[PDB]
Design a protein around this ligand. Structure first.
Ligand SMILES: *[C@@H]1O[C@H](CO)[C@@H](O)[C@H](O)[C@H]1O[C@H]1C[C@](C)(N)[C@H](O)[C@H](C)O1
Length: 7
């Protein structure tokens, strides 16, 4: 799960 980036 979670997410992140940076785009
Ligand atoms: C993004 O995740 C890293 C790893 O857990 C943390 O060290 C970091 O503090 C975190 O960044 C925060 C601050 C930011 C970039 N303004 C965003 O709100 C993110 C989602 O959370």
């Amino acid at each position: 799960x979670x997410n992140x980036x940076y785009x």
